[PDB]
Amino acid sequence: SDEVRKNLMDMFRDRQAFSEHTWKMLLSVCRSWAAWCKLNNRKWFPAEPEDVRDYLLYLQARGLAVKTIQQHLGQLNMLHRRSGLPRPSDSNAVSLVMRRIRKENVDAGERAKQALAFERTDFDQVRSLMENSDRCQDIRNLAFLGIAYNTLLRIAEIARIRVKDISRTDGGRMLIHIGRTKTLVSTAGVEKALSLGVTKLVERWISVSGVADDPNNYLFCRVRKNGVAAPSATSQLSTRALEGIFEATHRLIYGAKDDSGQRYLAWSGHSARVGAARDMARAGVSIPEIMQAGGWTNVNIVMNYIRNLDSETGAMVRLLED
Amino acid sequence: SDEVRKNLMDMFRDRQAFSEHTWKMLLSVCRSWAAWCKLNNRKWFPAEPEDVRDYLLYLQARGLAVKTIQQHLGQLNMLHRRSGLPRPSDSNAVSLVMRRIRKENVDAGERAKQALAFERTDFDQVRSLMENSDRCQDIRNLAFLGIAYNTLLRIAEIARIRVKDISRTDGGRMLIHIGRTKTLVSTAGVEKALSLGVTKLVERWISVSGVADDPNNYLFCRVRKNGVAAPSATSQLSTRALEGIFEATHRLIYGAKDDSGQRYLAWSGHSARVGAARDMARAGVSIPEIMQAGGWTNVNIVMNYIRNLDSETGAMVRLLED
Amino acid sequence: SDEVRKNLMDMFRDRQAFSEHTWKMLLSVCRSWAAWCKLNNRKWFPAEPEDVRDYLLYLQARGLAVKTIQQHLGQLNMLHRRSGLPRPSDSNAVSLVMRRIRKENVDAGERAKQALAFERTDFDQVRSLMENSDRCQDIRNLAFLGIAYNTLLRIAEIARIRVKDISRTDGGRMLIHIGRTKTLVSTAGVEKALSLGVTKLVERWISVSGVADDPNNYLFCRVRKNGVAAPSATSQLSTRALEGIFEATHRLIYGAKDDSGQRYLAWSGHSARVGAARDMARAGVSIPEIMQAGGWTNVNIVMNYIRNLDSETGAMVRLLED
Amino acid sequence: SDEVRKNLMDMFRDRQAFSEHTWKMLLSVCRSWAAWCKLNNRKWFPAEPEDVRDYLLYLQARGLAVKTIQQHLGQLNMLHRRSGLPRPSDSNAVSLVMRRIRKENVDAGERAKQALAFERTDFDQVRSLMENSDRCQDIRNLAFLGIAYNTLLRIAEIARIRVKDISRTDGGRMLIHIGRTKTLVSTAGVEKALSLGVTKLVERWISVSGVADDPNNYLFCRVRKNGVAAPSATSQLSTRALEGIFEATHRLIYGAKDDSGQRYLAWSGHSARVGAARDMARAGVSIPEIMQAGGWTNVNIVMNYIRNLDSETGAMVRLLED
DNA sequence: TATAACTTCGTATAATGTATGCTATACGAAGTTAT
DNA sequence: ATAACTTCGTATAGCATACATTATACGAAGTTAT
DNA sequence: ATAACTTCGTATAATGTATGCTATACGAAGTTAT
DNA sequence: ATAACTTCGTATAGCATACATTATACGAAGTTAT
Structure with missing residues (x-):
């Protein structure tokens, strides 16, 4: 005692x-x-x-x-x-x-449930609807969706990205250094590169928001009702706000939630991780490469995301289909 | 005490x-x-x-x-x-x-004895005989045999499938969710994919039986003598009955069992699991894929399944006849 | 105590x-x-x-x-x-x-050591060298080597074969029923089929020995210096004598062993099991099929037998040579 | 006490x-x-x-x-x-x-940091630069890099190879017997196969060093300033010196290291191991084959090795851009 | 009015993954037995 | 005198079995909507 | 003297097995600058 | 009077860490056959 x-x-x-x-x-x-x-x-x-x-x-x-x-x-x-x-x-x-x-x-x-997939088809669709909005809110949100899908970073990791974590590659792409890893041995690596398309989207958010005025500013910040962003080196956008972006984006296309109280009726924080895993599987990317792309060490997490894809139907379907 | x-x-x-x-x-x-x-x-x-x-x-x-x-x-x-x-x-x-x-x-x-194998060649022969039938019983039985061979599920697991456990891949192949096997109990469970041709068999059974009138109906049900299916959410088709389907199908092709009183003279509940395992083995399907197919996590079980591969048509005879 | x-x-x-x-x-x-x-x-x-x-x-x-x-x-x-x-x-x-x-x-x-391989080239060489012999001894010995190589049975298992274990297939081949399995769940199966060529070697031995005069006779028996076979239903040829056959056969071809005292300077009881695994591996027979052929449940025993074959050299060699 | x-x-x-x-x-x-x-x-x-x-x-x-x-x-x-x-x-x-x-x-x-990768592209470039050198030191060094990349062995394991540990496949590829690694101690050990190319590099080293004069000589030995090798059966080339080969090879191509005091500014003893693991993962080599190549028994270590795969040429950037 | 097509039930036996351990062959030498 | 074994003891290679379940096999008898 | 090591000390990463914390989800209440 | 957050608590998805080793990293100092 x-x-x-x-x-x-x-x-x-x-x-x-x-x-x-x-x-x-x-x-x-x-x-x-x-x-x-x-x-x-x-x-x-x-x-x-x-x-x-x-x-x-x-x-x-x-x-x-x-x-x-x-x-x-x-x-x-x-x-x-x-x-x-x-x-x-x-x-x-x-x-x-x-x-x-x-x-x-x-x-x-x-x-057991899992996030509704936010996939390439969804990203292209959102891109084609919101690309030419020059509202600050829309510009931020698109950059955020681009990073989420591109990097497979979790919402808490995205919220922690500071301006100074970003550099430029020899090839024109932004490279995001991971300031704080998930674990000591970082399975997802120490850096995430953005495609040239997502680089453009994030460049747009940076120039519109003014976040780069201080390298210590977090990349993402609050945008108030008057379309003015409020950069901060001390305060992150909450992971709750980041989930709100996913949900709002889904409401834009599909209208109000079904109200049944269920989870995952709209996109949430994990949606682009699920979606990216699925798109890599569709393209025939190796399991290990998919796992590294998201910092997975267990195959079964990944399997759950991709197991209803035709490319993952297994040997018996392959045998039976010739 | x-x-x-x-x-x-x-x-x-x-x-x-x-x-x-x-x-x-x-x-x-x-x-x-x-x-x-x-x-x-x-x-x-x-x-x-x-x-x-x-x-x-x-x-x-x-x-x-x-x-x-x-x-x-x-x-x-x-x-x-x-x-x-x-x-x-x-x-x-x-x-x-x-x-x-x-x-x-x-x-x-x-x-230890083993069930007689129900292999691809048997499934194909049975399908060529039965696929043109309009009898509800034949349509059911062919869908059952298709699932048994394609999925390698125990008959108890097949008996537990409900209509709501069925989904589709993007290519339109059927997917069956299974939460409980002899070795797995999980809310994540497993997904068993069906080929295009087996999907069609099950689609035919679904339309003719009316099981999908309630998503809680078991996929398989009894079919009385007038050819009418009796769907139910409370009563499974017995595993004894599913054994009966294998036995009746064996009789269809091979007539009556001999007199000896030995087990496994006809096909039985374990027959398509062993048949599918043997077909995968002969096709040179990788061990991880074989185990994925049967839902096994340990490699010694593959040897249990293929232990009775035909010796006369096996590797050494073929090597020697050179 | x-x-x-x-x-x-x-x-x-x-x-x-x-x-x-x-x-x-x-x-x-x-x-x-x-x-x-x-x-x-x-x-x-x-x-x-x-x-x-x-x-x-x-x-x-x-x-x-x-x-x-x-x-x-x-x-x-x-x-x-x-x-x-x-x-x-x-x-x-x-x-x-x-x-x-x-x-x-x-x-x-x-x-760690293993039996000197007795492979197809050795078997072909022995047959070529000995096939003109009409001696009961030589005829027995060729049939023994044929069974050992073809079936991958262990010497104790070969010593136990009885005449009544042998049946004929519709193809004309001998089929040896395994009277006593190694274990309760026999991973080698319940039967070993002989090739047409080894069937003929065994037929010759049966006719010169007289072993088939009683179906309970062991297939293999001793043959005294007068070239006369002594069939028995109660006495087996010793596993030591069966090793003697492999040794004497090696001695015929290669001469007397070194007096060094090392093991495996000549063929022994496990040599044809080792050789047959290597020949199957050279012919591209899948590992599960090789294992079933010898009744192996653990891959690594087989891998020790075939690890120095060019087909087993691994992925790094393939990447480098391509 | x-x-x-x-x-x-x-x-x-x-x-x-x-x-x-x-x-x-x-x-x-x-x-x-x-x-x-x-x-x-x-x-x-x-x-x-x-x-x-x-x-x-x-x-x-x-x-x-x-x-x-x-x-x-x-x-x-x-x-x-x-x-x-x-x-x-x-x-x-x-x-x-x-x-x-x-x-x-x-x-x-x-x-946690990781050795800089010494991959196939680095091996090919070093080989192009160094192939033609007739200095005993360079011949040794290229054979060493070849073995390190080809086998994925730890530097200490390579330093322990004796001439007698080397055999040949029927196709003439060298095989290296390894009895002891960080995770395995066995008289069965493992056999590590070399490509035809890397086999040739090793042969060249053996020819010029005179190590084969005694089967007990360690394969790798020091080479003094007059270009003469000093074979020994009692004294290994140090792992410190093996690290120095990686370091000097890096310096050949990239010049002298930063003065920053950070680790892994140049290739080090673990570099070809990580490089080879990454090459296998990008080539789509199966997990069991990657595991076989590195002598790993568990799947989570593959992820440790490939954690720093290049993001800019990674799967997501490629997917997004094409 | 019977019967197809089940269901229920008994005893009998096989199939799973994990953990741990016996069980065979190798072979020189001595003993045996019928030439 | 000797071929062709068998028996023996120990050295070493090769697999083997227990455990704690959870499942199927199948004849037979009982049931219910035709 | 010097190339090319070896020795040595501390600093830090890599393995396989067994077990357990650590993140996101989201409706609702609370906050703040328009 | 409100957009657009932040904070909160509980529900649930997702990974995470310890352990008992055995290894490498590397600057620097010491060593020997030229």
């Missing part, structure tokens, strides 16, 4: 050991679990196997995804392991229900 | 964590073992090593297969291990007798 | 859990280990980590191969695990010393 | 179970750690979690690489684990600080 107290003090002292996103999820899960425990007269810490099991059944009955349930369990595991206590996962009761819950939800037809 | 009862209770409480088939065989083996124990004045639980040893030798003396005897031992091991007790196989008497029985039976001529 | 005794008595009682070749090696290792222990004033049972370590270093200094050393350790491990005692391998000392031994022997240039 | 000294003595006694480099670095880190402890009034062994925590923060403050700090922690961990003591990383204070340091450094822009 003094041991657990000490262990948790260590966690606070070195809290930068974990992402702020990890902490947010931990806190969210602990609130959920503690609220459920107070309601059901259970002790929330240390978590007992039988109680954790009932809670997971609750999450299932609520309609949460299997991955959501795993997250809740994962956070409980982490809190306990770092406290020096036995993990909920290491119990018979919890291993058994998780097995049961996964099988039941799979058989009930639960599907 | 209270622990034992609690462990067993918890297993039964989350019984859906296990296959129906696992439970069915547990109960089947327990009955056999309990009946033998009553007759031989032994205690059925907890099971004593010397008694289990006598029981396994009794099973060998009954002329049962090695894989049958291992099933009985395996179910006994699971009952004990999941009670939190030592397995019968944790003792020398039982683990040595099991090895001894396997060795003696193999030395005496025993080998 | 009562528990060790009981455990060992269980082992005696179910002797047949292990191959006789396994017992012979356990007994051999125990002699060697116990004699070294007596010499060095050590207790041989239970074996202690420090003593096992010193013994392993003795084996190394003797010049025994790494596989041989592993064998002595594995037999020691077996005896202790089945006695219910801690295994020599589970100690820091023995674990550390095996790593050191492997590394030192490998750096000293110790190489 | 006696247990601890025994455990440590056992490790030292079987020194040879570990790489000489593991020992070198254990000693390097212990010196650094013990020197810091002396200056900071801490006890060096057994290490206190709080003291190790301070030391790691001290390394971070010095501007050392994340992988450097991991190495120090790693050697301290191994010293304690192999003593039979808890590792520093078994405490939160150490395991959390290590995560924190990694995350902070990466967030500040740190990423």
Whole structure:
């Protein structure tokens, strides 16, 4: 108990050991679990196997995804392991229900989702509609879509790009140095080159926005109702705003969302990563090259994006079709 | 003892964590073992090593297969291990007798049997005979055989396909989503692509049966004697019936089975999985593609499948006849 | 001590859990280990980590191969695990010393060996050289070499073939049913077909020997100095005699071996298995088909046989030469 | 405490179970750690979690690489684990600080670097420049570059090749037997095949060096200023000198290195390995074939190797521009 | 009024991926047996 | 005197089996909309 | 003396296996400069 | 009075890291046969 107290003090002292996103999820899960425990007269810490099991059944009955349930369990595991206590996962009761819950939800037809693809056909279409808008907002947004599709960078990585990360190649293209990599060994590399077409789009945004007046300015910034951009070296466009661009672009072409509350009814942050992976597959680019283009180390993530493409139909279709 | 009862209770409480088939065989083996124990004045639980040893030798003396005897031992091991007790196989008497029985039976001529292959040449012949039929039953059966051969799915997996699990590639080939196999349980699941010609077979079945009136209908259903399909979202076509389709199709080409009482005299549920594996092997399909096709993650299983490749038409005879 | 005794008595009682070749090696290792222990004033049972370590270093200094050393350790491990005692391998000392031994022997240039290949060119040469012989011996020996090369059966498997295992195909070829498979799931299949040419070699042997006079007769039998064959249904030709055939055949062509004492200076029991794999690989037979042909489940055994063939030289050679 | 000294003595006694480099670095880190402890009034062994925590923060403050700090922690961990003591990383204070340091450094822009690629285009250019030289040094150096690119072997593995390790395919291509790499120690080892071109470069070196006078000579040896090679069976050409060949070859083509003190301004020992991996990936060589070429057993390392594929000529730019 | 076309069920046996270990051949030498 | 084995012990190469499931095989008997 | 190494120390990257954090999604509430 | 954000919390998709080694990177100092 003094041991657990000490262990948790260590966690606070070195809290930068974990992402702020990890902490947010931990806190969210602990609130959920503690609220459920107070309601059901259970002790929330240390978590007992039988109680954790009932809670997971609750999450299932609520309609949460299997991955959501795993997250809740994962956070409980982490809190306990770092406290020096036995993990909920290491119990018979919890291993058994998780097995049961996964099988039941799979058989009930639960599907993992993924971003609606934003592909070359969509990019050309948006390009042909918005190319000659000289509204600042439209100019920024097109440059952003170009970079997203061209580089397969995640929204948080795009939001962090500074003017000084960009140089010019011998061949006329912009080259974006990756200032902060995703991991120590950067599978996606240290640089992303833009095509000559996307280079033009970004050049347009830079000259229109004034961001290059200070090399430390983030590439992308706020554009207010009066078509004036507000460059900043201290404040990034939020990843939320970047998702808004994808959604607005989709609304431009396809109108209002279907309202069914479902996810991925419009393009989102991951849409151009999915779309690019698909276009490379269509063109016959090797799996390893596709994986490097997006900084993937696992084939299965990529497979999920491209597995409904005719080029990926497998040997039996090939055998049967001659 | 209270622990034992609690462990067993918890297993039964989350019984859906296990296959129906696992439970069915547990109960089947327990009955056999309990009946033998009553007759031989032994205690059925907890099971004593010397008694289990006598029981396994009794099973060998009954002329049962090695894989049958291992099933009985395996179910006994699971009952004990999941009670939190030592397995019968944790003792020398039982683990040595099991090895001894396997060795003696193999030395005496025993080998595991395999389903008769249903290969491309059989699928093509059946299609040439049946494709012109207007009978609902023939249209169903041909679509089923097409899916079985094209996908290599177990008959239980095919029986679970619902109309909503079907999508299309950009080239218009059918894609089947499968979330649960014997080895995979996942909300990401797998996509099984159908050739253009098998897609057409399934399209014909769909139009004639009316299964797509509800996306929750199982793709396959019973077809009564008046030729009318009876679609259902609650009732699968039994795997016994799917075995029946293979058997009836074998009869169509080859007439009645011989008298011997051996298994695998006609095509059965495993036939097109083995046939497709053999065809891929003979075509020189790469091992990764073979494994992708059958959904295997380990390479030793490919050898299980192709173990009975025809020797007379095989490599060495062909090399020598030079 | 009562528990060790009981455990060992269980082992005696179910002797047949292990191959006789396994017992012979356990007994051999125990002699060697116990004699070294007596010499060095050590207790041989239970074996202690420090003593096992010193013994392993003795084996190394003797010049025994790494596989041989592993064998002595594995037999020691077996005896202790089945006695219910801690295994020599589970100690820091023995674990550390095996790593050191492997590394030192490998750096000293110790190489694992394999049978001298008996390939199609050798088989053709032998047939050409011997086909005018009318001696029962030579006729038997040619039929043996033909079966060995054509079927890739191991010598013990060949020694066990009975006359009743042989049937005729509609093509005129002999088909040898495998009476006793290597394992329960026979990756080599249940049958080996002979080419028309090897069928003829075998037909000649059957007619000069008289073996077919009783269907339970082993196919191969001894032939005494008067050129008279002695068929038997109860006595096999020894696997040692079958190795003698390969050796004598090599000696005919190449003369007497070096007196160096090295292994594989002439053909031996595994030579035609090695040769046939190489001939299939030269002919472009796929690796899975080569494996099925010899009943191999692990690729790397086969790869050791064919690794020096130009077809197996890899991607870098292909890139460079193109 | 006696247990601890025994455990440590056992490790030292079987020194040879570990790489000489593991020992070198254990000693390097212990010196650094013990020197810091002396200056900071801490006890060096057994290490206190709080003291190790301070030391790691001290390394971070010095501007050392994340992988450097991991190495120090790693050697301290191994010293304690192999003593039979808890590792520093078994405490939160150490395991959390290590995560924190990694995350902070990466967030500040740190990423692991990679050798500059020595690819086919570089090999062809060097070969064009150097082919005609009759200096023993250049002949040696070109044979070395050829082997390094063709085989992807580590420089230490190339330095260990003895003349006796070389055989021939039927088509006359050299094959190099390698028994030991960073991940494999085997008396079966691997055979690394050379192209006909690279075979010729090696033959030329063998002819002019006289290394083949003794099969035990290492293939590569020093060449003194009078252009005469000094073959040896006991002394390897150093890996330092092999790095110097890459460095001098780079300088030949690009001139002298920057004075910036950064690593990988010129080719180094890992360059042909990364270069060959990239060439295979761009050529569309199958993953299993890339794995076979580099002697890798796991797929994630391919991604480590190809992480810095050139973006400007990469798949996305090509897709967008054509 | 029967029957096609199922479904249910029992015992019997095969198929999966991961983890760990026996089981065969090699061969010089000695022993055997019918010429 | 000897060919042509068999038996033996140990050295070393080559595969092998357990485990904990989850599945199919198939005859037979029971069911339900024609 | 010098080419062409070798030795040595610390600094940092590369492997295969086992396990776990870390990002995006998005409706809604809150903020700010037009 | 509002466009166009930012902040927030929870749901869910996507990757991520530790471990226990074994390797290379490279400046600089020391070495030997010319």
